Coordinates of C-alpha atoms and ligand atoms in Angstrom, one line a residue:
Chain A
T1 CA 1.0 -63.5 59.1
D2 CA 0.7 -60.3 57.2
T3 CA -2.1 -58.0 58.6
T4 CA -0.5 -54.6 57.7
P5 CA -2.1 -52.7 54.8
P6 CA 0.1 -51.0 52.2
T7 CA 1.3 -47.4 52.6
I8 CA 0.5 -44.8 49.9
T9 CA 2.4 -41.6 49.2
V10 CA 0.5 -39.0 47.2
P11 CA 1.6 -35.8 45.6
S12 CA 0.1 -32.7 47.2
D13 CA 0.0 -29.9 44.6
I14 CA -1.3 -31.5 41.4
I15 CA -2.4 -28.6 39.1
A16 CA -3.8 -29.2 35.6
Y17 CA -5.1 -27.1 32.8
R18 CA -8.1 -27.9 30.6
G19 CA -7.3 -29.8 27.5
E20 CA -3.6 -30.3 28.5
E21 CA -2.3 -33.7 29.5
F22 CA -0.7 -33.9 33.0
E23 CA 1.2 -36.7 34.8
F24 CA 2.1 -37.6 38.4
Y25 CA 3.3 -40.7 40.3
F26 CA 1.9 -42.6 43.2
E27 CA 4.3 -44.4 45.6
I28 CA 3.1 -47.5 47.4
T29 CA 4.9 -49.6 49.9
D30 CA 4.1 -52.7 51.9
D31 CA 5.9 -54.5 54.7
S32 CA 5.9 -57.7 52.7
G33 CA 7.5 -56.0 49.8
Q34 CA 4.7 -56.8 47.4
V35 CA 1.6 -54.9 46.3
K36 CA -1.1 -56.7 44.4
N37 CA -3.4 -54.0 42.9
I38 CA -4.7 -50.5 43.3
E39 CA -8.1 -48.8 42.8
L40 CA -8.8 -45.2 41.9
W41 CA -10.5 -40.6 33.1
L42 CA -7.1 -41.3 34.7
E43 CA -4.8 -43.8 33.0
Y44 CA -2.0 -45.9 34.4
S45 CA -0.2 -49.1 33.5
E46 CA -0.7 -52.3 35.7
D47 CA 2.9 -53.4 34.8
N48 CA 4.9 -54.9 37.6
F49 CA 1.7 -55.3 39.7
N50 CA 1.5 -58.4 42.0
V51 CA 5.2 -59.2 41.5
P52 CA 7.3 -60.2 44.6
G53 CA 9.6 -57.3 45.6
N54 CA 7.8 -54.6 43.6
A55 CA 7.1 -52.4 46.6
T56 CA 10.0 -52.6 49.0
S57 CA 11.1 -49.6 51.2
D58 CA 14.2 -49.2 49.0
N59 CA 12.2 -49.3 45.8
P60 CA 8.5 -48.4 46.3
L61 CA 5.9 -49.2 43.6
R62 CA 5.7 -46.2 41.2
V63 CA 2.4 -45.9 39.4
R64 CA 2.6 -43.2 36.7
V65 CA -0.9 -41.7 36.3
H66 CA -1.9 -39.4 33.5
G67 CA -5.1 -37.8 32.3
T68 CA -6.6 -34.7 30.8
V69 CA -9.2 -32.4 32.2
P70 CA -11.9 -31.8 29.6
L71 CA -11.5 -28.6 27.5
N72 CA -15.0 -27.4 28.4
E73 CA -15.0 -28.4 32.1
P74 CA -16.8 -25.5 33.9
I75 CA -14.6 -23.6 36.4
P76 CA -16.3 -21.9 39.3
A77 CA -15.2 -18.3 40.0
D78 CA -14.4 -19.6 43.6
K79 CA -11.2 -21.3 42.4
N80 CA -11.0 -23.3 45.6
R81 CA -13.9 -25.5 44.2
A82 CA -12.1 -25.9 40.8
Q83 CA -10.6 -29.2 41.8
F84 CA -11.3 -33.0 41.9
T85 CA -11.0 -34.7 45.2
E86 CA -10.2 -38.4 44.5
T87 CA -9.0 -41.4 46.4
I88 CA -6.7 -44.4 45.9
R89 CA -6.7 -47.8 47.6
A90 CA -4.1 -50.6 47.5
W91 CA -3.9 -54.1 48.8
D92 CA -1.1 -56.7 49.2
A93 CA -1.1 -60.4 48.4
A94 CA -2.4 -61.3 51.8
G95 CA -5.6 -59.4 51.2
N96 CA -5.1 -56.3 53.4
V97 CA -6.4 -53.1 51.7
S98 CA -5.3 -49.7 52.8
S99 CA -7.6 -46.9 53.8
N100 CA -9.0 -44.5 51.3
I101 CA -6.2 -41.9 50.7
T102 CA -7.0 -38.5 49.2
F103 CA -5.3 -36.8 46.2
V104 CA -6.4 -33.5 44.8
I105 CA -6.4 -32.5 41.1
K106 CA -6.9 -28.8 40.8
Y107 CA -7.8 -27.6 37.3
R108 CA -7.4 -24.1 35.8
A109 CA -8.2 -22.3 32.6
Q110 CA -5.4 -22.2 30.1
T111 CA -5.0 -18.4 30.2
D112 CA -3.8 -18.8 33.8
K113 CA -0.8 -20.7 32.5
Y114 CA 0.1 -18.5 29.5
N115 CA 1.2 -14.8 29.4
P116 CA 1.7 -13.9 25.8
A117 CA 4.8 -12.0 24.7
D118 CA 4.5 -8.9 22.6
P119 CA 5.2 -9.3 18.8
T120 CA 7.5 -7.3 16.7
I121 CA 5.8 -4.1 15.6
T122 CA 3.7 -4.1 12.4
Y123 CA 3.4 -0.8 10.5
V124 CA 0.0 0.0 9.2
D125 CA -1.5 2.8 7.0
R126 CA -4.5 3.4 9.2
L127 CA -4.4 2.7 12.9
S128 CA -8.3 2.6 13.0
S129 CA -8.7 0.2 10.1
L130 CA -6.2 -2.5 9.5
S131 CA -6.1 -4.1 6.0
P132 CA -6.2 -7.8 5.4
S133 CA -2.5 -8.1 4.8
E134 CA -1.7 -6.1 7.9
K135 CA -3.9 -8.4 10.0
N136 CA -2.1 -11.4 8.5
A137 CA 1.2 -9.9 9.5
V138 CA -0.1 -9.2 13.0
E139 CA -1.3 -12.7 13.6
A140 CA 2.0 -14.2 12.2
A141 CA 4.1 -11.9 14.4
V142 CA 2.1 -12.9 17.5
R143 CA 2.4 -16.6 16.7
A144 CA 6.1 -16.3 16.0
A145 CA 6.7 -14.5 19.3
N146 CA 4.6 -17.0 21.2
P147 CA 5.7 -20.6 20.4
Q148 CA 4.9 -21.6 24.0
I149 CA 1.1 -21.1 23.6
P150 CA -0.6 -24.2 22.0
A151 CA -0.9 -24.4 18.2
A152 CA -4.6 -25.1 18.6
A153 CA -5.1 -21.6 20.1
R154 CA -6.7 -19.1 17.7
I155 CA -5.3 -15.6 17.2
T156 CA -7.7 -12.9 15.9
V157 CA -7.0 -9.3 15.0
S158 CA -9.6 -6.5 15.1
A159 CA -9.9 -3.4 13.0
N160 CA -7.9 -1.2 15.3
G161 CA -5.1 -3.8 15.7
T162 CA -6.2 -5.4 19.0
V163 CA -5.1 -9.0 19.3
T164 CA -7.3 -11.7 20.9
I165 CA -5.7 -15.0 21.8
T166 CA -8.5 -17.6 22.4
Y167 CA -7.0 -20.7 23.9
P168 CA -8.4 -24.2 23.1
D169 CA -10.6 -24.1 26.3
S170 CA -12.1 -20.7 25.1
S171 CA -10.2 -18.7 27.7
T172 CA -8.7 -15.5 26.3
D173 CA -5.8 -13.1 26.5
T174 CA -5.7 -9.6 25.0
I175 CA -2.8 -7.6 23.6
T176 CA -3.6 -3.9 23.1
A177 CA -3.0 -2.1 19.9
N178 CA -0.1 0.1 21.0
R179 CA 1.9 -3.1 21.8
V180 CA 1.2 -4.5 18.3
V181 CA 0.9 -1.8 15.5
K182 CA 2.3 1.6 14.7
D183 CA 1.4 4.2 12.1
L184 CA 3.7 3.8 9.1
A185 CA 3.9 7.5 8.2
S186 CA 4.7 8.7 11.7
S187 CA 7.7 6.4 11.8
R188 CA 9.2 7.5 8.6
Chain B
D1 CA 11.1 9.1 -44.4
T2 CA 7.5 10.4 -45.0
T3 CA 5.1 7.7 -43.7
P4 CA 4.3 7.3 -40.0
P5 CA 5.0 4.1 -38.0
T6 CA 2.3 1.5 -37.4
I7 CA 1.4 0.2 -34.0
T8 CA -0.3 -3.2 -33.6
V9 CA -3.1 -2.3 -31.2
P10 CA -3.4 -4.9 -28.3
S11 CA -6.4 -6.6 -27.0
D12 CA -8.4 -5.1 -24.2
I13 CA -7.2 -6.0 -20.7
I14 CA -9.2 -7.2 -17.7
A15 CA -7.2 -6.1 -14.7
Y16 CA -8.0 -6.8 -11.0
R17 CA -7.2 -4.5 -8.1
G18 CA -3.9 -5.5 -6.5
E19 CA -3.0 -8.0 -9.3
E20 CA 0.0 -7.2 -11.4
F21 CA -0.5 -7.5 -15.2
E22 CA 1.6 -7.0 -18.3
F23 CA 1.3 -7.1 -22.1
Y24 CA 3.3 -6.0 -25.2
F25 CA 3.0 -3.5 -28.0
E26 CA 4.5 -4.0 -31.5
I27 CA 5.6 -1.1 -33.6
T28 CA 7.0 -1.0 -37.1
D29 CA 8.4 1.7 -39.3
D30 CA 10.2 1.9 -42.7
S31 CA 13.5 3.1 -41.2
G32 CA 13.6 0.3 -38.7
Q33 CA 14.0 2.7 -35.8
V34 CA 11.5 4.2 -33.4
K35 CA 12.5 7.0 -31.0
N36 CA 9.8 7.3 -28.3
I37 CA 6.1 6.6 -27.6
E38 CA 3.4 8.4 -25.7
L39 CA 0.9 6.8 -23.4
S40 CA -2.1 8.9 -22.2
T41 CA -5.5 8.1 -20.6
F42 CA -8.8 9.7 -21.6
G43 CA -10.2 11.6 -18.7
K44 CA -6.9 11.5 -16.9
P45 CA -4.8 14.5 -18.1
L46 CA -2.0 13.4 -15.7
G47 CA -1.9 9.7 -16.8
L48 CA -1.7 6.7 -14.6
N49 CA 1.4 6.6 -12.4
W50 CA 0.8 2.9 -11.7
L51 CA 0.8 2.0 -15.4
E52 CA 4.4 1.8 -16.6
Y53 CA 6.1 0.8 -19.8
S54 CA 9.7 -0.2 -20.5
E55 CA 11.9 2.2 -22.5
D56 CA 14.3 -0.6 -23.3
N57 CA 15.8 -0.7 -26.8
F58 CA 14.4 2.7 -27.4
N59 CA 15.8 4.9 -30.2
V60 CA 18.5 2.4 -31.1
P61 CA 18.6 1.6 -34.8
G62 CA 17.1 -1.5 -36.2
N63 CA 14.5 -2.0 -33.4
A64 CA 11.3 -1.6 -35.5
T65 CA 11.5 -3.6 -38.8
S66 CA 8.7 -5.4 -40.6
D67 CA 10.3 -8.8 -39.6
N68 CA 11.6 -7.7 -36.2
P69 CA 9.4 -5.0 -34.6
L70 CA 9.7 -3.1 -31.3
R71 CA 7.9 -4.9 -28.4
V72 CA 7.2 -2.5 -25.5
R73 CA 6.5 -4.1 -22.2
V74 CA 3.7 -2.4 -20.4
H75 CA 3.0 -3.5 -16.8
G76 CA 1.1 -2.2 -13.8
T77 CA -1.2 -2.8 -10.9
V78 CA -4.6 -1.3 -10.3
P79 CA -4.6 0.4 -6.9
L80 CA -6.2 -1.5 -4.0
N81 CA -8.7 1.4 -3.2
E82 CA -9.6 2.3 -6.8
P83 CA -13.3 2.8 -6.7
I84 CA -15.5 0.4 -8.6
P85 CA -18.5 2.3 -10.1
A86 CA -21.9 0.6 -9.7
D87 CA -22.2 0.9 -13.5
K88 CA -19.4 -1.5 -14.4
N89 CA -19.3 -0.1 -17.9
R90 CA -17.5 2.9 -16.4
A91 CA -15.0 0.7 -14.5
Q92 CA -12.5 0.9 -17.3
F93 CA -9.7 3.1 -18.6
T94 CA -9.4 4.0 -22.3
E95 CA -5.7 4.3 -23.3
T96 CA -4.2 5.8 -26.5
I97 CA -0.7 5.3 -27.9
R98 CA 1.4 7.4 -30.3
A99 CA 4.8 6.5 -31.7
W100 CA 7.6 8.6 -33.2
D101 CA 10.1 7.2 -35.7
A102 CA 13.7 8.5 -35.9
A103 CA 12.8 11.1 -38.5
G104 CA 9.8 12.5 -36.6
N105 CA 6.7 10.9 -38.1
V106 CA 3.9 10.4 -35.5
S107 CA 1.7 7.4 -35.9
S108 CA -2.1 7.4 -35.8
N109 CA -3.4 6.9 -32.3
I110 CA -4.4 3.3 -31.4
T111 CA -6.8 2.7 -28.5
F112 CA -7.4 -0.1 -26.1
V113 CA -9.5 -0.5 -22.9
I114 CA -8.2 -1.6 -19.5
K115 CA -11.2 -2.9 -17.6
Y116 CA -10.6 -3.1 -13.8
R117 CA -12.7 -5.2 -11.4
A118 CA -12.7 -6.2 -7.8
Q119 CA -10.1 -8.7 -6.8
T120 CA -12.7 -11.4 -5.9
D121 CA -13.8 -11.5 -9.5
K122 CA -10.6 -13.2 -10.4
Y123 CA -10.8 -16.0 -7.8
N124 CA -13.2 -18.8 -7.4
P125 CA -12.0 -20.7 -4.3
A126 CA -12.1 -24.5 -4.1
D127 CA -13.9 -26.1 -1.2
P128 CA -11.6 -27.6 1.6
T129 CA -11.8 -31.1 2.9
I130 CA -14.5 -31.5 5.5
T131 CA -13.6 -30.5 9.1
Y132 CA -15.5 -32.5 11.7
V133 CA -16.7 -30.2 14.6
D134 CA -18.3 -31.0 17.9
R135 CA -21.1 -28.4 17.5
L136 CA -22.1 -26.6 14.3
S137 CA -23.5 -23.8 16.5
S138 CA -20.2 -23.1 18.3
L139 CA -16.9 -24.1 16.7
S140 CA -13.9 -24.4 19.0
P141 CA -10.7 -22.4 18.4
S142 CA -8.9 -25.5 17.2
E143 CA -11.7 -26.3 14.8
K144 CA -11.5 -22.8 13.2
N145 CA -7.7 -23.3 12.9
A146 CA -8.3 -26.5 11.0
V147 CA -10.9 -24.9 8.8
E148 CA -8.6 -22.0 7.9
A149 CA -5.7 -24.4 7.3
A150 CA -7.9 -26.6 5.1
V151 CA -9.1 -23.6 3.0
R152 CA -5.6 -22.3 2.7
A153 CA -4.1 -25.7 1.7
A154 CA -6.7 -26.2 -1.0
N155 CA -6.2 -22.7 -2.5
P156 CA -2.5 -22.0 -3.3
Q157 CA -3.6 -19.6 -6.1
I158 CA -5.4 -17.3 -3.6
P159 CA -2.9 -14.5 -2.6
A160 CA -1.1 -15.0 0.7
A161 CA -2.1 -11.4 1.7
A162 CA -5.8 -12.4 1.7
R163 CA -7.1 -13.2 5.1
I164 CA -9.3 -16.2 5.9
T165 CA -11.8 -15.9 8.8
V166 CA -14.1 -18.6 10.2
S167 CA -17.4 -17.8 11.9
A168 CA -18.8 -19.6 14.9
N169 CA -20.7 -21.9 12.5
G170 CA -17.9 -22.7 10.0
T171 CA -18.8 -20.1 7.4
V172 CA -15.5 -19.1 5.6
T173 CA -14.9 -15.5 4.6
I174 CA -11.9 -14.9 2.3
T175 CA -11.1 -11.2 2.4
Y176 CA -8.8 -10.2 -0.4
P177 CA -6.2 -7.3 -0.2
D178 CA -8.7 -4.9 -1.8
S179 CA -11.3 -5.8 0.9
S180 CA -13.5 -7.7 -1.6
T181 CA -14.7 -11.0 -0.2
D182 CA -15.4 -14.6 -1.2
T183 CA -17.7 -16.8 0.9
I184 CA -17.8 -20.6 1.4
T185 CA -21.0 -21.7 3.0
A186 CA -20.8 -23.9 6.1
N187 CA -22.3 -27.0 4.4
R188 CA -19.2 -27.1 2.1
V189 CA -16.8 -26.7 5.1
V190 CA -17.8 -28.4 8.3
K191 CA -19.8 -31.4 9.6
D192 CA -20.9 -32.5 13.1
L193 CA -18.9 -35.4 14.6
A194 CA -21.7 -37.5 16.1
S195 CA -23.5 -38.0 12.8
Ligands
CA201 CA1 1.2 -56.1 54.2
CA202 CA1 -3.2 -15.3 30.3
CA203 CA1 8.6 6.5 -41.1
CA204 CA1 -14.5 -14.6 -6.0
CA205 CA1 -5.4 -17.1 10.8

């Protein structure tokens, strides 16, 4: 008679960024070789659930879980609190449910993930007052040099040529003017 | 040859700062040939170095007949920082043109006016398709990207050098190369998603 609850393997360093989809896998085994169901804004497919031989020791049950931390999820300055502590249960066909097993989802601002590369230099007439065409060229050069930042991020250019990269979660990066623009006359 | 050539005086031109324009003269003399022309501006004793004319087909015989005259291509661009006087009646240049034939007759001077205006006076931007935002009081970075892309996609005639900015409320500012602006109010641009 089966009286042994299933065993759950959880990943340990799940880190996510706001507005960006993440994925990870649970691994569940039972001595009978069969796992009936599990219990946890996180999505996963119940395919191959409650099938004989779906959770052997050779081939554990792999539950691909995916979700997205909300773009505007507040992040405390004490980044050890910027995490979700959640639990997962699982039971076999005999009706033996495992204990509550913890997995941690730590969420961070998008600027923690991205370090923007400097663009090719744009030559301007006045370092203190960029024209509209020069600002367009600055934004295009920053975007072309940074294909790894999301397309939904907004790049703005100030009068002195300073670049502000506002990511979809409203976090920011800054590129100073002397990494972006140069006086046209002093270079000729 | 005793009588001077005749120049068909062109219509007055409305030019915009940063926008290239062009037009044509037409000159006719008895000999059929015209040597050179003179282009000067009243109040500008050194002329306009941004207003050019083509010296093509000049002085060659048969270029200025009554049936086939000499068409001179005059082109130029008003500078981006050309000051626009508050009295727009003074925001214009009065040109004058003389023409020599092969012999040496000079024509009477014909005059025409080049009125220059801000670059925004040429453009009346079309409204974009509505961008649905989460909060009219604070647009997201992606919502402003969609607004700018929608305004740019609906206005291919607006110069690519013009910069489109989006405020926190969806107000669109189109800044043209000469720093003149167009404005598209938020009610024509964005809407809240819940409604
Ligand atoms: Ca069991
Ligand atoms: Ca960063
Ligand atoms: Ca003559
Ligand atoms: Ca306008
Ligand atoms: Ca832009």
